Each structure stands twice: as structure tokens, then as C-alpha cells.
Write a protein that binds this DNA or RNA. Structure first.
Ligand SMILES: [Mg+2]
Ligand SMILES: [Mg+2]
Length: 476
RNA sequence: AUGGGCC
RNA sequence: GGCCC
């Protein structure tokens, strides 16, 4: 978004730490073009004269402003999408109890007991268990006091910046393109869950093309559902954004929140108010305090669902800004945050749509880059969604999420000390869809050192997961 | 080092 | 704990 202020405060918030990721035996063998993200300025792998802390805020280039006519247009799309959405989810969106916000419900995971609390708790050595009782689902004085404030709508907060200790393409490491997480205070997360926790549960349970969202899906078993759905259309588009999160303009955010979370849909009046506190935020990084306008704080605030809803409304608004008579049935789409798959039988011109996404401050481009702009005819077996391809399992005939072996190799070449065993059994679950031969190759560097799940066991597990009867069929 | 999914 | 946004 738009960085309006850049002040320097005396007290300092720490981030620059060492990476917990370490090279495994696989690394020496596979030799991936991947590595831990740069977390320091003194990182020897960084390109000369490349200032880390400067490349982290280079995503905030502007809070694009919309005219009155586009705003009224956007509002129309938001209300149309809100309509479909709640039409499918229902309208039992009353607040959750504090107990229910902490433990969650069906469709909603409980809160994480041992993660960061945000500010200003980080300036007091307090963990999450020190503020909240994740057992009995209870909160302490500070929190409760903070809840009243939020009830009063007089709550003020700041985001704590964290560099993401993940593996990335070496090109992005060297370019110091480490991604960051805007850790919000723990009370904010909780209150958000109270205000919109039921809604999020419903979204997770109802994931699919109908609501245009994959949040809460399980690739292993939903690829079949999503795959058959999309192979059903003439055109399919793998659309990429750049800085989706950052490029949400206040206009757009403010209109979605107003349109999707109205009290008539069952929401407590504070739902709209809490979300709106994500627009203009103050971000604390070491000795720096940075006030930003526009953009959704990445990681802490039903971030995925908000990013997904917006994505749906962006597509409907672009199409409508270019074509006449466009409705939600004109096309079909599933998204997960910024990740998106769009499909239609009309020769929709996504090359012409670019400017219209620009009118929102968003930059769309084809996934398959080598191709000059968006083409037509592409089928679902060409796109990526959630870093997985849609391939046909020749054993069952079901679609299966296949990850690129280069990616898998990367994942297997770095690990957090003392978790290699768990991680493997975890990655095996993903590798099984590559096939027997690839599966063997991938884990070969680990054989005789860890327990590698057999291809057969994970395969049988999958077949049942995806379609229990298909398993029974193989027995009749 | 996180929101949220999925194991 | 691990992956995916
Ligand atoms: Mg502004
Ligand atoms: Mg994609």
C-alpha cells in the first residue's frame, strides 16, 4: 500500500535471526536451485549492495484510488458475490463465544497455543499461554481489557514484522526477496475469530467453485472434485498476480467489508469495524515504525478468506468493466488467497482485462510466461493451483495433485534440525502422486537412515481418501 | 518467525 | 511439527 510515514522510535523490535533451516543429505545429492531466505543484511549469499530491509517495503508502491463510477461498480460486484456467498453459507453468523474462538468448531481450527502474540506483548517476554488459557478457553486481564476496548471500537494496535524463514528460489534469495509476515496482536486475532469465526467455518466446509474458494480443501481428495469441474469448460486460465496482498486499495477493501459483512447477513456490527482496522496500519520493524495505507496485513486476520473473497470480486469487476451482461454464471473460478483458476466457454479476453485489474492497482499476468500474453484453449491439465498440477491417475482415473519434482527436491533438501523424520513421512504424502519411479528417486538419499513410507501404502491410503468405493471396487 | 487451511 | 496462500 501507500507508506505515508516513516518514524524512528527508541525501543527496538527484533527480527534479524539465524535461519533454522539446515541442508539434509538430499541437498548434496539433488543440488536444488533453492535455499533458506535471506534473514540478515550480512548474509554472504546476498548480491553486493543489496539492502535487505529496503527490499521488504518495496512492495508498498501506492494505494491506488478508484473513481466514483468504479467504486459503485465494485460495490455492485461485491454485493452480487456477497449474495451468492451467503445464499450458500446461510446467515447464522452471530459472534462466537470466547471459548469457541479459542478451541474453534467444525470447520475452524483452534488457535495455536505456542505461536507469537504480536505487540506489545513481545516487549514483555510474554508468550501466548501467558495471556490466554488455551486449555479452558479463557483470557487474562490484559486481553479482556483489550476486548472491551474493541467492543468500544477504541482499540489501537501495531503489526510486528517477521521475516519468513522458508526455502526460496536462489534467484529470490540473492535478490533479497524475503517475504514478511505482519504478526498482529493475539487479542486482535481472537476478536476477529469471534466476529467472523462462524462465517469462516462455513466457508471451509463449503469450499468449491460455487463460492469460488478452496480454503479448507484437501488437495488429495478435492482435486477430483475440482478437476472434473474445470475439464468441463472450453477455456482455462492460470492467472498470476504480483503483490496481491500489498496491492489491495483501501477503496476496494472498505467496500468489500461493508458489502460482505453487513448486519443483515447476520454479522455483529463490529465485524465490519474490526476488518476495517486492517486497512491503515502501523508496522513496527526493528527501530522503524511505518504507517501504511491500503493492503491486507499478510498473516493474522482471516487473511486467506479475505484475499479469496477479494479475488472473486476482482474477476467479476474486471469482466463487467469490459463486457456487457456479465454475471457469476458467465465464468467459473476457484481461488486460494492470490492463487486462482478461472474458466469459461466464452472466448473471454484476459489480455484486454489487464488495465481493468490495474484500475484496482493489481497486476495480472499469465502463469506460463514463455507465451506472449493470455491464450485461449488451455485445459485444466495445463494449470497450476496450490503448487500442484492436475494429472489423471492411470490406476483409478481420478485427478491427483502433482507437484514438480524440482519443488519436491527443494522441500527435501532443507529441514529444521530434529524434524527430518516427521517431515519425510509428511512429504511422502505429497511425493506419492509423482509415481513409483519418481517416489523412489526422491527418497533414495534417505534410505537406510529414516523410515520411508512405501509407495504402495500411501497409494492405497490415497485411493480410499479420494473415493472409498474405488477402493472397494478393487476388491469386488 | 504468523493468519488460515489441510496431516 | 510439515506443506500450501
Ligand atoms: Mg490513501
Ligand atoms: Mg497459479
Amino acid at each position: 500500500g501507500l507508506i505515508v510515514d516513516t518514524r524512528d522510535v527508541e525501543e527496538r523490535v527484533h527480527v534479524m535471526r539465524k535461519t533454522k533451516l539446515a541442508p539434509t543429505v538430499a541437498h548434496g545429492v539433488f543440488n536444488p536451485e533453492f535455499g533458506p531466505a535471506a534473514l540478515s543484511n550480512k548474509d554472504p549469499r546476498l548480491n553486493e549492495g543489496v539492502v535487505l530491509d529496503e527490499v521488504i517495503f518495496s512492495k508498498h508502491k501506492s494505494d491506488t484510488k478508484m473513481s466514483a463510477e468504479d467504486k459503485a461498480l465494485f460495490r455492485r460486484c461485491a454485493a452480487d458475490y456477497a449474495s451468492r456467498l451467503h445464499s450458500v453459507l446461510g446467515t447464522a453468523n452471530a459472534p462466537l463465544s470466547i471459548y469457541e474462538a479459542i478451541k474453534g468448531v467444525d470447520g475452524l481450527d483452534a488457535m495455536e497455543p505456542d505461536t507469537a502474540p504480536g505487540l506489545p506483548w513481545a516487549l514483555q517476554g510474554k508468550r501466548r499461554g501467558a495471556l490466554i488459557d488455551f486449555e479452558n478457553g479463557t483470557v487474562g486481564p490484559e486481553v479482556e481489557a483489550a476486548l472491551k476496548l474493541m467492543e468500544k471500537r477504541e482499540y489501537k494496535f501495531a503489526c510486528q514484522t517477521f521475516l519468513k524463514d522458508e526455502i526460496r528460489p536462489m534467484e529470490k534469495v540473492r535478490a533479497g526477496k524475503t517475504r514478511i509476515v505482519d504478526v498482529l496482536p493475539v487479542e486482535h486475532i481472537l476478536y476477529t475469530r469471534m466476529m467472523i469465526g462462524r462465517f469462516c467455518a462455513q466457508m471451509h466446509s463449503n469450499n468449491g467453485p460455487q463460492i469460488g474458494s478452496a480454503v479448507g480443501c484437501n488437495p488429495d481428495v478435492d482435486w477430483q472434485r475440482f478437476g472434473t469441474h474445470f475439464a468441463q469448460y472450453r477455456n482455462v486460465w492460470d492467472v498470476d498476480y504480483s503483490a496481491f496482498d500489498a496491492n489491495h486499495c483501501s477503496d476496494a477493501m472498505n467496500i468489500m467489508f461493508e458489502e460482505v459483512f453487513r448486519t443483515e447477513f447476520g454479522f455483529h456490527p463490529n465485524a465490519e469495524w474490526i476488518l476495517k482496522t486492517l486497512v491503515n496500519t502501523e508496522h513496527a520493524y526493528e527501530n522503524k515504525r511505518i504507517t501504511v495505507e491500503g493492503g491486507i496485513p499478510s498473516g493474522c486476520s482471516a487473511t486467506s478468506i479475505i484475499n479469496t473473497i477479494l479475488n472473486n470480486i476482482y474477476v467479476l469487476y474486471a469482466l463487467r468493466r469490459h463486457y456487457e451482461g456479465v454475471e457469476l454464471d458467465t465464468y467459473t473460478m476457484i481461488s486460494y488467497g492470490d492463487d486462482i483458476v478461472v474458466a469459461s466457454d466464452y472466448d473471454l479476453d484476459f489480455e484486454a482485462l489487464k488495465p481493468h485489474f490495474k484500475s484496482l492497482g493489481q497486476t495480472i499476468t499469465p502463469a506460463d510466461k514463455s507465451d506472449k500474453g493470455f491464450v485461449l484453449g488451455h485445459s485444466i491439465t495445463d494449470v497450476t493451483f496450490l503448487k500442484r498440477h492436475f494429472h489423471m491417475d492411470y490406476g483409478t482415473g481420478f485427478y491427483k495433485p502433482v507437484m514438480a519434482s524440482k519443488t519436491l527436491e527443494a522441500i527435501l533438501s532443507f529441514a529444521r534440525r530434529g524434524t527430518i523424520q516427521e517431515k519425510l513421512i509428511s512429504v511422502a504424502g505429497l511425493a506419492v502422486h509423482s509415481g513409483p519411479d519418481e517416489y523412489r528417486r526422491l527418497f533414495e538419499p534417505f534410505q537406510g537412515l529414516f523410515e520411508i513410507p512405501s509407495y504402495r501404502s500411501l497409494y492405497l491410503r490415497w485411493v480410499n481418501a479420494v473415493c472409498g468405493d474405488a477402493a472397494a471396487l478393487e476388491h469386488h
